[PDB]
Design a binder for this molecule. Structure first.
Ligand SMILES: Cc1cccn(O)c1=S
Ligand SMILES: [Zn+2]
Length: 257
């Protein structure tokens, strides 16, 4: 089944998921000179004060930090969105080396990793129904560069030992995702897809212009996770990113001048 290796990586996905070659796939390169300022965009509203994290899981492709999404507790609205989208999970994509790992690129620049905060449109009732809709998800994408540590990341890095291999989970309550955000909420936005199978075309992407800094030792800990399950040969969880896909008939809009 699908993964990030030579025989089951991104170039193979289209055989099980033909939407891989669709009209609104992600990630894409963000050409900053070509992205037009849209003064009708709103400021993004990120309301995470009531966020209830539950659990962290190694799903064999990434780790997910999951939230209670059974009430409007941690929501994204405004920016390019109509309506209210509820946080369900976040995860990252990262490299084996600091020079690669992000999925979106900015004038072809790759960051060391990229955080995805995944939210579903509450007009659709749940995540499953939302992913059948072209406006079912909003993902806030935040780039990571290696420099100073991000203190708000450390509780995630510290628990990774406990979910080393595929299928492991751990209790992960009272984590506050506000500690993962940069200062500015200036962003680029375009219609896209999940960047992992099933690659569904449901996503309003909102990609923050300002990266966060994480330390070398923090990203080193991501790279000790494993794609395999316990008892199988060790294959380090690195380079779980999809390269940029054709922009096709899409315009990337900037919320800022
Ligand atoms: C939106 C989303 C959901 C599940 C996995 N991944 O990678 C993404 S980007
Ligand atoms: Zn993702």
């Amino acid at each position: 089944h699908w993964g990030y290796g030579k025989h089951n990586g991104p170039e193979h996905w289209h055989k099980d998921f033909p939407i891989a070659k669709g009209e609104r796939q992600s990630p894409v390169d963000i050409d900053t000179h070509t992205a037009k300022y849209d003064p009708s965009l709103k400021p993004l509203s990120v309301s995470y004060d009531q966020a209830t994290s539950l659990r962290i899981l190694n799903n064999g492709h990434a780790f997910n930090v999951e939230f209670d999404d059974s009430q409007d507790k941690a929501v994204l609205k405004g920016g390019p969105l109509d309506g209210t989208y509820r946080l369900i999970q976040f995860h990252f994509h990262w490299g084996s080396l600091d020079g690669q790992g992000s999925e979106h690129t900015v004038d072809k620049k790759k960051y060391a990793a990229e955080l995805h905060l995944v939210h579903w449109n509450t007009k659709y009732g749940d995540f499953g129904k939302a992913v059948q809709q072209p406006d079912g998800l909003a993902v806030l994408g935040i780039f990571l560069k290696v420099g100073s540590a991000k203190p708000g990341l450390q509780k995630v890095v510290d628990v990774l030992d406990s979910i080393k291999t595929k299928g492991k989970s751990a209790d992960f309550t009272n984590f506050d995702p506000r500690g993962l955000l940069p200062e500015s909420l200036d962003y680029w936005t375009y219609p896209g897809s999940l960047t992992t199978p099933p690659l569904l075309e449901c996503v309003t992407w909102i990609v923050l212009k300002e990266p966060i800094s994480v330390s070398s030792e923090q990203v080193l800990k991501f790279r000790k996770l494993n794609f395999n399950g316990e008892g199988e040969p060790e294959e380090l969880m690195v380079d779980n990113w999809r390269p940029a896909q054709p922009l096709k008939n899409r315009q990337i809009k900037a919320s800022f001048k």
